[PDB]
Amino acid sequence: MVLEATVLVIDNSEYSRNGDFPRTRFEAQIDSVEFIFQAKRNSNPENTVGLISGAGANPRVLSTFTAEFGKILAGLHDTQIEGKLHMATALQIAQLTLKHRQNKVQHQRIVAFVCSPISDSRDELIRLAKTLKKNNVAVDIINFGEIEQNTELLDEFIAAVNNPQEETSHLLTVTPGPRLLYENIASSPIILEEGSS
Amino acid sequence: SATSGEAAALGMGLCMLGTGKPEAIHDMFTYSQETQHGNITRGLAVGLALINYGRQELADDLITKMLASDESLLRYGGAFTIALAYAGTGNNSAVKRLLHVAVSDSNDDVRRAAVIALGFVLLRDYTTVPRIVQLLSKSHNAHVRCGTAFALGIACA
Amino acid sequence: TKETVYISSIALLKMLKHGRAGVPMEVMGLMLGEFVDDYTVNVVDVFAMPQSGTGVSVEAVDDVFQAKMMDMLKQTGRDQMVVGWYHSHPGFGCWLSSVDVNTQKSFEQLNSRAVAVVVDPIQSVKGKVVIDAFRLIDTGALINNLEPRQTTSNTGLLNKANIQALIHGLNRHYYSLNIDYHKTAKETKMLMNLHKEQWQSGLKMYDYEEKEESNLAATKSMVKIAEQYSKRIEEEKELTEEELKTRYVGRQDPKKHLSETADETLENNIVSVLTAGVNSVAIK
Amino acid sequence: KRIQSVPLVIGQFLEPIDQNTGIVSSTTGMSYVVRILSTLDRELLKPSMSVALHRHSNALVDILPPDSDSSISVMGENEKPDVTYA
Amino acid sequence: HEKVTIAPLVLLSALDHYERTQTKENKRCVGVILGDANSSTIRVTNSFALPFEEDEKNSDVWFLDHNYIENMNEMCKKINAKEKLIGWYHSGPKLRASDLKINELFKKYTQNNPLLLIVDVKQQGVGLPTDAYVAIEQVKDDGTSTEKTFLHLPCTIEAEEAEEIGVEHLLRDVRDQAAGGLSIRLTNQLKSLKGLQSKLKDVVEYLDKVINKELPINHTILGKLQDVFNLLNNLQKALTVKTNDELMVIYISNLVRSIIAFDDLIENKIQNKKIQEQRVKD
Amino acid sequence: LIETVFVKNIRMLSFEDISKATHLPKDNVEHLVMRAISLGLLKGSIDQVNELVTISWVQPRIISGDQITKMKDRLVEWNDQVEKLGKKMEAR
Amino acid sequence: DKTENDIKALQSIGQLIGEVMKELSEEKYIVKASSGPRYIVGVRNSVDRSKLKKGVRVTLDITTLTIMRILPRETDPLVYNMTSFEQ
């Protein structure tokens, strides 16, 4: 829509370190995330993607706001091989991250990659969901592999944030299978509403 | 605006001529920490001396609060407020409080403030005017020698 | 027509670390703050420019260096509006630099509130900041004749010779200002308690008494050996029957042979009082 | 004393005149009478030791310590000689 | 020996940011130090500010920019290229435990030994509240595990030619540097004992923390508080026989030579007597 | 015995309670403690003719909490004596 | 292109000759300029005291009177100092 600052949260747990996708998982994820960084870079001149690791025995930080994927590579080649995803603590870091933006003209859309199920209750995320509408920021949820072996705990997180598509509350779902990893974006609405290809 | 800001501070102090009221005193003291202008900040301290006329020792509470601050512009009425009816024969306790403050601090606003009450106490005898303040011209400095003849133009005029 | 310059304590010393004791090849930088023209001047946020081989150049004036600095203003929370630029020159008697004024001219039309404050890294050794200012005409009588420095009496600007007497004719290119310093409550007693004289010396209980084993006898030797000489020399010099006063050696000859011996007795009496007695604070 | 500071000009002592007033010979051969600083130690003066002056004002700066030794005359000591006396 | 020397501009630069964003009341402001030290001695002069935010309820909430904040160091590299990152400084009014977990992220960008300072928003103590930390692996006798902890070292305030007279020119009010400074320091030494006595009142609360509900007991603290008796008080009475004699010798040599040097002012009456003889022309 | 010997001013034991508790001759007990002395327990030096055990006690002796009632209070009340006597030094 | 660097070089005047004689203060030492009378100049932090010892050529400014950098010791290989014809 307009100038936005993407907040990227990936999952470093054991499910991202395996070959579950029948080509490559973590090897092609470096390119797929880079292609998303390059897609938003051509749409808007101001591109800053924070890289926050919300897994691996409490949330970590790999990269920071930058205009080039070179600094992101420092966090792509270094991945913690243990721990699981903690949604409660990592989101509170993302809430404070929303206030570190440079100018008010730069919007924010939180993008989260969830490779592993979480034990966090949904009621804890409801009160934390009101911070999205308070700062007028967007949210993007990309989850694959959890929906098969577990229910969706972030569905009610979108309910309290539910708003028309001109502001926030964009829910996405990715189901793996006999496909291409970069092709997973095609099923997501994020690839649509674009006049460049 | 620093143009009419200090001029408005003088009119506010002229509103109360007499014993005064503590309500108008606390208001002018609170606004001193808000505005960034020097003439307005000092203008609020100048008006405090005009609000209290004849209060004298009962005004030492406001005088203590002004002299306790580190700001130079907040010390003004620590002299003029004390000496009003003390013309002619005065009190040595009022002068003693202005000695150690002026001699210890070389600041301009702190030293020039106490000079105001010096000319009021010396109205008793013109011959004794170049006596107490006689030490002001014996040293070498601008403001130390500047406060010398101020008392000579009042009682000795 | 007339102004007055006020500079806070935080904005007072930054570059002077590089300017004063950080040797020549001085740098420059930007000043920030908020004030009202013709009355007061305020400087708060300051950050310097990069150093090059030629010193001040176009690359330092270029905003590419400032582009990443302006982004750090909102992040660190410290942000203001441009109040001017600052420079340094190694004490030129006349016409420090005409390049820094050209930078002031190009940035004057976009601000008109900018003040150029330069300081001498050489002659500031005395501890006092050298006061100099370059500014465009404020509300102009300066195109012909006007007197800057509100309260035109004030105090003699000193300096040296040339630009002191060039104020009248060159007033268009040179606008004089009196620079004053100020500090708030958090800048007054807060820093004084941690500085005073020398250092703050945290944990005052640390002293040299815990180091005293053989030096206790060494202190007893210093209050005797060197003192016995001061006793004989004092009588040796006074024994002279010449006198005659007038001039002779009397500038200071006798100090070391007479009066300093009394001070030399005191020098060993000061270190005796230094620890004095019972410096273990009562107990046993 | 800090008004002098770095521009040291090496002088030479000549003869005292008055308290804090004296003539100081210069290495250029031009004697100058300058006011002696009251901080300076006046019992260390000799018609040998060099002193410090100024470039423009040519005023006496500081009385130099015993470290005033100048190596222009090659001032040094002997380190581990060779020829033996015995 | 490792001695941290801190410039006072570090405290003044952070004090401005405390007023701007109103950062106080258990809110840490992270920063980074600067200097060139290849030895154990650490020299801290210039310092930057890191836009850090934390939660009061959750101490595990931390966000710190890696290469985005280093742009200030890149801008300073062209200014001074001799100084690099030797460490970092935080606030930590209640001393959050977040710094104990990860010592690698801060050491990755700082090639020097890990150093952690403390700049409080208050810093109003008469003592030395500024404290330094060195994160290493130290053996603990508590019986749990040997892990990375903080090593305390004394620090001070730096004074160089630039800021030495600059602060004195700003104050120029109360100095009083003379032989009478003993009364100021020895009283402060008594205040230092009273300042530690206030810390002993926190030790009184330490027992109340054991009285509190489900709190452990530190065995390392008990080791230092166990020797307070046998060390340094009627035990020293046996050594007071020869000890008091050493304090008397100081009084012997002092009082005999103190009344000598003060007798050289007799010339005052001699000069005043000559004034009356000079009154022929007066 | 180390906990027993330490009350206020007594740092010193004798050969009485040490030999009677261990049921060993005093000749060996002198050299048997020295094997435990090298472990860092006590740095003292035992005498012979005086029949008195000098004790330099470096041992940490953990598991506290019986002493801390009186131990911690003696670091305050006895330290308050210094604070009371130091109030007359406030003249300068 | 080589002349343009000299246009911007008007701010830095060509420095005179100097050699360290005897250590006096911490940094600043006693240096007699062979280009004239005895002038003790300042020092700069761009260099350290390892090469500032006695018997080495230094670089001293005419106006500011400091030590800029440390140049190697020059024996002035003139025609009579070192003959251009060798062997």
Swiss-Prot record, chain A:
GO BP: proteasome assembly; proteasome-mediated ubiquitin-dependent protein catabolic process; ubiquitin-dependent protein catabolic process
An example of a Gene Ontology cellular component annotation for this protein is:
nucleus
Keywords noted in UniProt: Proteasome, Ubl conjugation
Record PTM text: Ubiquitinated, leading to its degradation. Ubiquitination is promoted by HUL5.
The keyword Ubl conjugation is annotated on this UniProt entry: yes
Q: Per UniProt, what is one GO molecular function of this protein?
A: K48-linked polyubiquitin modification-dependent protein binding
Reported consequences of knocking out the gene: Cells are viable.
Every copy of the VWFA domain together lies at 5-190
Other facts = Present with 17200 molecules/cell in log phase SD medium.
Membership in a protein family? Belongs to the proteasome subunit S5A family.
Task performed by this protein: Multiubiquitin binding protein.
Record note on quaternary structure:
The 26S proteasome is composed of a core protease, known as the 20S proteasome, capped at one or both ends by the 19S regulatory complex (RC). The RC is composed of at least 18 different subunits in two subcomplexes, the base and the lid, which form the portions proximal and distal to the 20S proteolytic core, respectively.
Please report the name of this protein according to its UniProt entry.
Answer: 26S proteasome regulatory subunit RPN10
Q: State the organism of origin.
A: Saccharomyces cerevisiae (strain ATCC 204508 / S288c)
Portion of the full-length sequence here: 1 to 197 of 268
From Swiss-Prot, chain D:
Q: Which residues of the full protein are shown?
A: 87 to 172 of 428
* Compartments where found: Cytoplasm; Nucleus
Q: How is it modified after translation?
A: N-acetylated by NAT3.
Q: Which domain of life is it from?
A: Eukaryota
- Summarize the protein's role: The 26S proteasome is involved in the ATP-dependent degradation of ubiquitinated proteins. The regulatory (or ATPase) complex confers ATP dependency and substrate specificity to the 26S complex.
Q: What is this protein called?
A: 26S proteasome regulatory subunit 6B homolog
The record's family statement is: Belongs to the AAA ATPase family.
Source organism of this protein record:
Saccharomyces cerevisiae (strain ATCC 204508 / S288c) (Baker's yeast)
From Swiss-Prot, chain E:
Check the record and name the InterPro entries matching this protein.
EIF3F/CSN6-like_C, JAMM/MPN+_dom, MPN, MPN_RPN7_8
Instruction: Tell me which residues make up the MPN domain.
Output: 4-139
UniProt function note: Acts as a regulatory subunit of the 26S proteasome which is involved in the ATP-dependent degradation of ubiquitinated proteins.
One Gene Ontology BP term is: proteasome-mediated ubiquitin-dependent protein catabolic process
> PTM per UniProt?
N-acetylated by NAT1.
Q: Does the keyword Acetylation apply?
A: yes
Q: Which key words are in the record?
A: Acetylation, Phosphoprotein, Proteasome
Entry GO MF terms: metallopeptidase activity
Q: What is this protein called?
A: 26S proteasome regulatory subunit RPN8
Please give the GO cellular component terms listed in this UniProt entry. proteasome complex; proteasome regulatory particle, lid subcomplex; proteasome storage granule
Which family, according to the similarity comment? Belongs to the peptidase M67A family.
Other notes: Present with 19800 molecules/cell in log phase SD medium.
Curated annotation (Swiss-Prot), chain G:
User: Could you state what the record's PTM comment says about this protein?
Assistant: N-acetylated by NAT1.
Q: Which family does it belong to?
A: Belongs to the AAA ATPase family.
Q: What does this protein do?
A: The 26S proteasome is involved in the ATP-dependent degradation of ubiquitinated proteins. The regulatory (or ATPase) complex confers ATP dependency and substrate specificity to the 26S complex.
Q: What is the protein named?
A: 26S proteasome subunit RPT4
Species source reads Saccharomyces cerevisiae (strain ATCC 204508 / S288c) (Baker's yeast)
Upper classification of the source organism reads:
Eukaryota, Fungi, Dikarya, Ascomycota, Saccharomycotina
Task: Supply the gene name.
Answer: RPT4
